[PDB]
Design an enzyme around this catalytic site. Structure first.
Site, PDB file in Angstrom:
ATOM      1  N   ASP A  87      -1.369   5.708  -5.598  1.00 24.76           N
ATOM      2  CA  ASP A  87      -1.679   4.592  -4.558  1.00 24.76           C
ATOM      3  C   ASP A  87      -1.990   3.457  -5.184  1.00 24.76           C
ATOM      4  O   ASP A  87      -3.086   3.029  -5.182  1.00 24.76           O
ATOM      5  CB  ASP A  87      -2.583   5.225  -3.966  1.00 24.76           C
ATOM      6  CG  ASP A  87      -3.406   4.495  -2.410  1.00 24.76           C
ATOM      7  OD1 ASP A  87      -2.333   3.622  -2.125  1.00 24.76           O
ATOM      8  OD2 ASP A  87      -4.500   4.470  -2.347  1.00 24.76           O
ATOM      9  N   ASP A  94       1.051  -1.230   0.153  1.00 17.40           N
ATOM     10  CA  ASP A  94      -0.427  -0.191   0.196  1.00 17.40           C
ATOM     11  C   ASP A  94       0.739   1.694   0.005  1.00 17.40           C
ATOM     12  O   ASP A  94       1.431   1.915   1.238  1.00 17.40           O
ATOM     13  CB  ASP A  94      -1.163   0.052   1.114  1.00 17.40           C
ATOM     14  CG  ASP A  94      -1.815   0.976   1.654  1.00 17.40           C
ATOM     15  OD1 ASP A  94      -1.940   1.694   0.850  1.00 17.40           O
ATOM     16  OD2 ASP A  94      -2.745   1.778   2.414  1.00 17.40           O
TER      17      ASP A  94
HETATM   18  C1  LIG Z   1      -2.666  -0.301   7.575  1.00 17.46           C
HETATM   19  O1  LIG Z   1      -1.727   1.521   8.143  1.00 17.46           O
HETATM   20  C2  LIG Z   1      -2.880   2.523   7.809  1.00 17.46           C
HETATM   21  C3  LIG Z   1      -2.820   3.673   8.297  1.00 17.46           C
HETATM   22  C4  LIG Z   1      -3.664   4.622   7.895  1.00 17.46           C
HETATM   23  C5  LIG Z   1      -4.672   4.150   6.581  1.00 17.46           C
HETATM   24  C6  LIG Z   1      -5.328   3.186   6.225  1.00 17.46           C
HETATM   25  N1  LIG Z   1      -5.134   2.566   5.418  1.00 17.46           N
HETATM   26  C7  LIG Z   1      -6.200   3.571   4.588  1.00 17.46           C
HETATM   27  C8  LIG Z   1      -6.947   2.687   3.851  1.00 17.46           C
HETATM   28  C9  LIG Z   1      -7.387   3.322   2.079  1.00 17.46           C
HETATM   29  O2  LIG Z   1      -8.689   4.657   2.829  1.00 17.46           O
HETATM   30  N2  LIG Z   1      -6.567   3.353   1.234  1.00 17.46           N
HETATM   31  C10 LIG Z   1      -7.334   4.125   0.125  1.00 17.46           C
HETATM   32  C11 LIG Z   1      -5.355   2.326   1.140  1.00 17.46           C
HETATM   33  N3  LIG Z   1      -4.634   3.144   0.365  1.00 17.46           N
HETATM   34  N4  LIG Z   1      -4.901   1.841   2.566  1.00 17.46           N
HETATM   35  C12 LIG Z   1      -6.207   1.293   2.906  1.00 17.46           C
HETATM   36  C13 LIG Z   1      -6.996   0.578   2.886  1.00 17.46           C
HETATM   37  C14 LIG Z   1      -7.148  -0.173   1.962  1.00 17.46           C
HETATM   38  C15 LIG Z   1      -7.686  -0.993   1.711  1.00 17.46           C
HETATM   39  C16 LIG Z   1      -8.030  -1.863   0.327  1.00 17.46           C
HETATM   40  C17 LIG Z   1      -8.678  -3.378   0.334  1.00 17.46           C
HETATM   41  C18 LIG Z   1      -9.339  -3.943  -1.045  1.00 17.46           C
HETATM   42  C19 LIG Z   1      -8.362  -3.607  -2.331  1.00 17.46           C
HETATM   43  C20 LIG Z   1      -7.878  -2.341  -2.063  1.00 17.46           C
HETATM   44  C21 LIG Z   1      -6.901  -2.726  -3.452  1.00 17.46           C
HETATM   45  N5  LIG Z   1      -6.356  -2.163  -4.324  1.00 17.46           N
HETATM   46  C22 LIG Z   1      -7.395  -1.880  -1.120  1.00 17.46           C
HETATM   47  C23 LIG Z   1      -8.107  -1.765   2.537  1.00 17.46           C
HETATM   48  S1  LIG Z   1      -7.615  -0.635   4.581  1.00 17.46           S
HETATM   49  C24 LIG Z   1      -5.189   1.517   4.436  1.00 17.46           C
HETATM   50  N6  LIG Z   1      -3.410   2.178   6.581  1.00 17.46           N
END
Ligand SMILES: COc1cccc(N2C[C@H]3C(=O)N(C)C(=N)N[C@@]3(c3cc(-c4cccc(C#N)c4)cs3)C2)n1
EC number: 3.4.23.46
Length: 390
Positions: free
Chosen positions: A232, A36
């Protein structure tokens, strides 16, 4: 390719995210972790959950260290809560090193772990500024670089299949590569073009022009980066600011007007299907995003195809039709170049030189008539004005 040990180390798809295998603790506990670039915490499931078949068991790790502090992270459409600590972490198909890193042990979550998804945690690769609870919690990559001789750079090749992958298939298929500490030349064709990382928090960039089949969307470029533009890997869609989304959808509808699609399709809610093999790729336009270059008054463009922005999905009737969902949606938090954008390119996160590189991906989906592209240079004036300031 000089990084064979890391090539093809990812699995997954845009809709569920792409993950890499990691180990935590002593003895090592293997977990699948979502890559991520949109967050900066390394957080893993640390307690039983209906959608997890394994999790981090701190009591079984001799190297676990309790930081005696909690962390609460509520984000749009979900949230997770956990306990902070550190442990020895490694990446089997990565650099041959082990580092002590911070780990957020997830004890409670909401709409975080998805049923069917094969990952048990998330690896936030962005900068400390956005780490939770605050910037004092050193991100995994910073720890890796500080503790080893691994170069301050990683690159991602996310590979969309171009068709639906069932449960069995997605687990047995190669979804891409995450090269830690370098650039593998076998993952792309053509040249790499770099855009500056505007500021180190999210991987922020500046878009200076947008085209739909060569036609200039013609908006004040500040609109393209309101209130920011980021890359992202943790976002499925290409997300655009409300006003930009409205203009882009109008242009994409006009270009594809020979076929009418329901409002639900354009809202990214309902799928559209065509008889096997007859998807009319040619009626949909290519989309070009021009990014600020490294040289003054110079930009370059990355062009994606509908094979990137139309996400393959299985038909409800599991028929033999080829179906998709429109993977461009609106945002109230700026442009987000998500997985459907990254699937077209090999993306180099050159932290060392504060820049992001793009090259045509060796695994991007295309047809015999069109291909994704990364081209330049173009003369572009007053690009700094395209950046937004609160
Ligand atoms: C892990 O620590 C932290 C800390 C702060 C924020 C944070 N997050 C904010 C979330 C978010 O809204 N976006 C956009 C992101 N970039 N990452 C997160 C997640 C993404 C998915 C997810 C699920 C399915 C598919 C996809 C795809 N492609 C992504 C689940 S949680 C984690 N995490």
């Amino acid at each position: 390719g000089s990084f064979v040990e890391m090539v093809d180390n990812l699995r997954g798809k845009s809709g569920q995210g792409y993950y890499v295998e990691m180990t935590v603790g002593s003895p090592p506990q293997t977990l699948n972790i979502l890559v991520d670039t949109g967050s900066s915490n390394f957080a893993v499931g640390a307690a039983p959950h209906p959608f997890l078949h394994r999790y981090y068991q701190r009591q079984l790790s001799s190297t676990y260290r309790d930081l005696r502090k909690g962390v609460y992270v509520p984000y749009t459409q979900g949230k997770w809560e956990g306990e902070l600590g550190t442990d020895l972490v490694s990446i089997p198909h990565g650099p041959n090193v082990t580092v002590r890193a911070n780990i957020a042990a997830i004890t409670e979550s909401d709409k975080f772990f998805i049923n069917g998804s094969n990952w048990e945690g998330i690896l936030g690769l962005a900068y400390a500024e956005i780490a939770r609870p605050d910037d004092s919690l050193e991100p995994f990559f910073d720890s890796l670089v500080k503790q080893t001789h691994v170069p301050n750079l990683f690159s991602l090749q996310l590979c969309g299949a171009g068709f639906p992958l069932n449960q069995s298939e997605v687990l047995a298929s190669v979804g891409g590569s995450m090269i830690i500490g370098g650039i593998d030349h076998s993952l792309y064709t053509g040249s790499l073009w770099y855009t500056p990382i505007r500021r180190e928090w999210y991987y922020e960039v500046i878009i200076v022009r947008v085209e739909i089949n060569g036609q200039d969307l013609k908006m004040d470029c500040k609109e393209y980066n309101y209130d920011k533009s980021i890359v992202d890997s943790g976002t499925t869609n290409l997300r655009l600011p409300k006003k930009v989304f409205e203009a882009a959808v109008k242009s994409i509808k006009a270009a594809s007007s020979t076929e009418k699609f329901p409002d639900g399709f354009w809202l990214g809610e309902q799928l559209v299907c065509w008889q096997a093999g007859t998807t009319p790729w040619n009626i949909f336009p290519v989309i070009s995003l021009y990014l600020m270059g490294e040289v003054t008054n110079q930009s370059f463009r990355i062009t994606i195809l509908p094979q990137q922005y139309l996400r393959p999905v299985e038909d409800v009737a599991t028929s033999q039709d080829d179906c998709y969902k429109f993977a461009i949606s609106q945002s109230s938090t700026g442009t987000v170049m998500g997985a459907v954008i990254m699937e077209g390119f090999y993306v180099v996160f050159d932290r060392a030189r504060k820049r992001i590189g793009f090259a045509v991906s060796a695994c991007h989906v295309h047809d015999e008539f069109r291909t994704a592209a990364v081209e330049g240079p173009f003369v572009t004036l007053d690009m700094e004005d395209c950046g937004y300031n609160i």
